Structure 1
Amino acid sequence: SKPFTLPILTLGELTNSRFPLPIDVLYTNPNESAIVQCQNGRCTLDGELQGTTQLLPTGICAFRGKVTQQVQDEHRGTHWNMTVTNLNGTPFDPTEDVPAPLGTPDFSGQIYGVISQRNTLPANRAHEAVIATYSPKFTPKLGNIQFSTWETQDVSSGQPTKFTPVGLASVDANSHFDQWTLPSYSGALTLNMNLAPSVAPVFPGECLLFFRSFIPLKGGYGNPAIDCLMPQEWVQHLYQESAPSLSDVALVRYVNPETGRTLFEAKLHRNGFLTVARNSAGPVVAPTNGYFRFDSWVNQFYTLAPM
């Protein structure tokens, strides 16, 4: 029975599985009223990828496809319809048991980045772009999305197109940023399918523990963050190892290697998320050279040492 393990990469050596950002802090928010059901950064402890999760850090919130039509929006500038493929270039088959192409964004918001094209030496262009994932035109499970640009004309149709994500366009009221609200992958009247399950503590006094990254903004006021359940390197490790889960809950300890001291402990649940016994919201203050070490398999009734 291949023993279970976590990477020994430290906090300052990890990246977010839901947006291409470094991990900045560990974070809790016990009074969260939203159902937590993100679709990127989802992997079971025995290495099963779920939701829209894929392995490439470059694939998170990325799209590939081709533009088909230009449409001026009445309020939000120039829009472009885009057919999307899988990130490996193959056609996306909507009958596969996934919510949307792997890497599709998993939250409501205006995602800011750059659209680039290299024609089928070829000509090239790139421009800043925004994808409103709450729009009725955001239908990646149906093979098509829309993006908008400040550029009014220089986007070509029928040519290979890449979206490289960079941050958010805004977090104003009118920009519908909510990291826990899933897009409607097939449009508003259609149910999402093949989702990774929601996650929650099941024991009193526990809360979820997140790996938090602060996300850039194109403009406006705000200090937005994206919280993932496990960093991308954990997804990659678990997929590689595929170690059998010996119970439903692993016990992990956050350790300071220099002193060898454990700073706190957490439950790492089979479905791929952490809980801690903490009754406060906000960052965990601890060294970014610290790291989680697997201790032993426990169960849902194990009582964590309070933080």
Structure 2
Amino acid sequence: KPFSLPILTLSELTNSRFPVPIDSLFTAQNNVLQVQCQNGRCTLDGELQGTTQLLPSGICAFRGRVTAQINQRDRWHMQLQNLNGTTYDPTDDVPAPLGTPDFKGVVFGMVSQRNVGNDAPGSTRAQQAWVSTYSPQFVPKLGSVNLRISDNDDFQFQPTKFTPVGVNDDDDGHPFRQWELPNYSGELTLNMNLAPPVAPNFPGEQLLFFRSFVPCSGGYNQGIIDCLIPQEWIQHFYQESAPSQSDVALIRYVNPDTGRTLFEAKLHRSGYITVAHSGDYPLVVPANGHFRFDSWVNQFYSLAPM
């Protein structure tokens, strides 16, 4: 019934857009470029949106069966299941199977197989793999993605899991763009059932992000993945399902030792945070700090500058 947040420091939080811990808080200058991530989307009354599911280990993961190979760089055709192993239904009201990556780039990690049926049941293998979300075969909404793997001679048409490790630019100039959605149904097709874009409306306000610097596999990319709210908050809201009393929950970032409030922010009903600030700024805050719910306010509440 009453709304609340879990009590967790930054290093006790997991990025909802990639399965790594949160490193820092960041507020971004408002730009023409649209924020419309599909992972890490959840209302304050606990409605998961976009491709959001509950498990950190589901974020940017795939599960399915490899069924074919093609003579293209994205060689191995992986027919997808839901992450829990149930049959994926392409007519479901989602942009893609839950956990699908929500950015343009290459996700690198490992694939693992475990055979079932007649052909060496129980036999296993694992190796490095990449998934390009630029690929014309990246069609997860339709029910498949194609994989690039390091050893084409040790891979079978068997149950397969992709475990993500990090991200990068592709090596042919297709850059890692965290705010550009992939085409979940491929070239010439438009995305559907998307979680809506988010932006501050109030003047002087900017989005606040929970920022992670994820692993990269070569070159100098910083590996920045920003999420709106951390996975643990999504998990908490899902459990609680506290009805939202207004469009905005006022929240305070507190220092629990000294008891002082360091700044305040607007946590919007649809599950994102704004602050009163101008310019890009990595926040300077004590390590023990965390947000607490203060009160229900509205869109036009005037935040103390941060």
**TM-score interval (norm. to shorter):** over 0.9
| Paired residues for 1:18-167 under 5 Å | 18-73=17-72, 76=73, 79-120=75-116, 122-157=122-157, 159-167=158-166
Distance 1:247 1:168 in 2: 37
Taking structure 2 as the reference length, the TM-score comes to: 0.96
Distance 2:12 2:170 in 1: 28
Instruction: Confirm or deny that 1:288 pairs with 2:287.
Output: yes
Partner of 1:247: 246
Q: Match of 2:16, as an amino acid? A: S
User: Which blocks of at least 5 consecutive residues in structure 2 are unaligned?
Assistant: none
Instruction: Confirm or deny that 1:198 pairs with 2:197.
Output: yes
| Paired residues for 1:140-289 under 5 Å | 140-157=140-157, 159-170=158-169, 174-289=173-288
The 8 Å contact of residues 116 and 125 in structure 1, kept in 2 or not, is answered as: yes
- The alignment partner of 2:219 has SS state of strand
Q: Match of 1:80, as an amino acid? A: W
Tell me how far 1:195 sits from its aligned partner: 0.8
The 8 Å contact of residues 278 and 306 in structure 1, kept in 2 or not, is answered as: yes
Distance 1:221 1:46 in 2: 40
Q: Match of 2:93, as an amino acid? A: D
The 8 Å contact of residues 171 and 220 in structure 1, kept in 2 or not, is answered as: no
Distance 2:182 2:128 in 1: 22
Q: Deviations over 1:162-216 (max 9, x none)?
A: 0000001436671321001111111121111111111100100100000000011
Displaced runs of 4+ in structure 1, greater than 2 A? 70-73, 169-173
Tell me how far 1:69 sits from its aligned partner: 1.8
Distance 1:273 1:50 in 2: 13
The 8 Å contact of residues 168 and 221 in structure 2, kept in 1 or not, is answered as: no
Tell me how far 1:11 sits from its aligned partner: 1.1
**Matched-pair identity in %:** 68
Q: Which moved more, 1:90-99 or 1:41-50?
A: 90-99
Q: Match of 1:4, as an amino acid? A: F
User: Which blocks of at least 5 consecutive residues in structure 1 are unaligned?
Assistant: none
